[PDB]
Structure 1
Amino acid sequence: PRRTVVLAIDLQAGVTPGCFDEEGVLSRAAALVERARAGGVPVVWVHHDPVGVGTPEWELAAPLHRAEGEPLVRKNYRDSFADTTLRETLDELGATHLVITGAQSDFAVRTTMQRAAAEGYDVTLVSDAHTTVDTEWEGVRISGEQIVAHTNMYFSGLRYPGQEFVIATHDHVAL
């Protein structure tokens, strides 16, 4: 029996500023979480401790708010499963299918969504609810917008035997 969990990664006040389409992405993430709550779909929050434990930057970016009962997993690396309670938290919920929203597309989101796939989960990436910042390397620029687009392209074709991957918008993903 499929149980869906929404996994909201590093949507922290110190992470999202300057990200591509920041206000819109935060707005659609919020809408997604509301829809999950209305559907009785569990929401699990992941926070990156190196943002600065105890500082305002570590807390959820506005307008996101955690509800009573919703687990919060703290991590120190890009992979939300690495040395964390995430797997235990998910197993306790009987999770089989993760619906992923968060930041940043190319770091925590990238590394966590691929780890989840490797672990055997069905994964749905919410195409209009993740973001990152402009960057450059080796003398070429790559915008946040380009990284978001390329991420959605990558995920749309991801396949593992016996597993299901879906790319879907915040208001069409099945909850």
Structure 2
Amino acid sequence: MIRIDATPYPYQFHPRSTALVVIDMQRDFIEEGGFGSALGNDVRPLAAIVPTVAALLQLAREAGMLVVHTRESHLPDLSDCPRSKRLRGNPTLGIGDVGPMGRILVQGEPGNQILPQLAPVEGELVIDKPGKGAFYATDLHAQLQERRITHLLVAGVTTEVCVQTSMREANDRGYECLVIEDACASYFPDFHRITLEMLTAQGGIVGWRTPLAQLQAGV
């Protein structure tokens, strides 16, 4: 039983019944000249968390905890990609179009791959999700129930989209979720900040948040 100083009150977990979930740490969103930059976004806040996510992964692997990685991705034939999502915003470079690191949001492309320095090792779960929420159209809920997981440590990008959605999904499904605040990032500083406040608002309506240092202190 490990007790972590957290907002809005201390967070308790057992490593055996806890998993680390690292959401969408994908080359196209984070690397200089990748698709993120092209759309005009500041990738720097995302690159700046890479060392903290790496230390979270090493903490989980040392503790022998389950590790889940997610990738936002579609089948190369775009058959799991809703028409709504493909048309949304009439993008010049849309899902499946050739971007700087290959076909945008497509399974097996270089830009779709998880950063090498945070990449999955053998024994870790890897979920390809067609939506922002890690639980929609995936077997993530079933896989965690098979492993008797009750508690999630959450990290990744972006805070107000995939992280928030996945965390809201997990909260509804009965998981106790701790987002590691310095291991999440957004293209929008204000969205990052208000999302973290929303998640722990009203006595922890979605869950808990703490910096890496409080997690390391607990273990």
Same fold (TM over 0.5): yes
In the alignment, what sits opposite 2:210? 168
Match for 1:13 among 4, 27, 47? Answer: 27
Cα 1:101–1:28, aligned 2, differ >3 Å: closer, same or farther? same
1:128 aligns with 2:182: yes
Q: Secondary structure of 1:32's match? A: helix
Q: Secondary structure of 2:114's match? A: coil
Distance in structure 2 (CA, Å) of the matches to 1:113 and 1:19? 22
In the alignment, what sits opposite 1:75? 129
Instruction: Give a deviation string over 1:81-121, Cα, whole Å, max 9, x none.
Output: 11101111111221101110011112111111001111111
Per the normalisation by structure 1, the TM-score is 0.84
Larger Rg: 2
1:36-55 pair list within 5 angstroms = 36-50=60-74, 51-55=105-109
Cα 1:67–1:158, aligned 2, differ >3 Å: closer, same or farther? farther
CA shift for structure 1 position 171: 2.9
- 5+ long unaligned stretches in structure 2: 1-12, 32-41, 75-104
Q: Secondary structure of 2:212's match? A: coil
In the alignment, what sits opposite 1:152? 196
Distance in structure 2 (CA, Å) of the matches to 1:159 and 1:91? 26
1:18-33 pair list within 5 angstroms = 18-33=42-57
Per the normalisation by structure 2, the TM-score is 0.68
Q: Secondary structure of 2:27's match? A: coil
Higher mean C-alpha deviation, range 117-126 or range 18-27: 18-27
Cα 1:116–1:158, aligned 2, differ >3 Å: closer, same or farther? farther
Identity across matched positions, percent: 23
Distance in structure 2 (CA, Å) of the matches to 1:102 and 1:32? 11
Distance in structure 1 (CA, Å) of the matches to 2:23 and 2:51? 15
Instruction: Give a deviation string over 1:58-82, Cα, whole Å, max 9, x none.
Output: 1112421211100101110111111
Distance in structure 2 (CA, Å) of the matches to 1:63 and 1:158? 37
In the alignment, what sits opposite 1:115? 169
Q: Residue 10 of structure 1 contacts residue 102 of structure 1 at CA under 8 Å; is this kept in 2? A: yes
Q: Residue 30 of structure 2 contacts residue 47 of structure 2 at CA under 8 Å; is this kept in 1? A: no
Q: Secondary structure of 1:56's match? A: coil
Cα 1:109–1:158, aligned 2, differ >3 Å: closer, same or farther? farther
In angstroms, what is the RMSD of aligned CA positions? 2.0
Q: Residue 20 of structure 1 contacts residue 131 of structure 1 at CA under 8 Å; is this kept in 2? A: no
In the alignment, what sits opposite 2:91? none
In the alignment, what sits opposite 2:87? none
- 5+ long unaligned stretches in structure 1: 134-143
